[PDB]
């Protein structure tokens, strides 16, 4: 509801058969200007780096807990993407209602902007 950004959310996710490849969240985006959402697609590693990024400019208390996980193979098989699709929701969440100098960071619209960038 907060500064521009106004809602979002991890819409759903796709890929990655005959495991070996990978999954791409698709978050959606509502802003104060505009009345349709836009659509963002991110990998779990960008989501995480974006934590990581956010993690050298901000102590940790002022952060979300970030859902940590992501090897290569051997796993949950790929209820794991659907799990992410939840917690990668939550962090969004908690990102959005932190304090504004986390939520309207350029590290944080930065991430928003651009469908691939």
């Known amino acids: ?10 819409f759903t996710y ?7 490849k990978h999954y ?7 802003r104060e200007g505009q009345i349709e959402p836009s659509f963002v ?3 779990f590693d960008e989501f995480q780096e974006l934590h990581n990024k956010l993690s050298i400019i901000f102590p940790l208390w002022k952060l979300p807990g970030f859902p940590n996980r992501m090897v290569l193979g051997r796993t949950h098989i790929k209820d794991v993407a659907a799990k992410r699709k939840i917690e ?8 959005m209602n932190a304090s504004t100098d986390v939520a309207e960071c350029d590290l ?3 991430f928003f902007h651009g469908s691939h960038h």
């Open 88 to 95: 990668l929701n939550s962090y969004l969440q908690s990102l």
């Open 24 to 30: 791409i969240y698709v978050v959606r985006i509502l």
């Open 14 to 20: 796709h890929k990655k058969y005959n495991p070996d």
């Open 1 to 10: 509801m907060d500064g521009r950004i106004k809602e979002v959310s991890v």
């Open 41 to 43: 697609f991110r990998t």
């Open 108 to 110: 944080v619209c930065t």
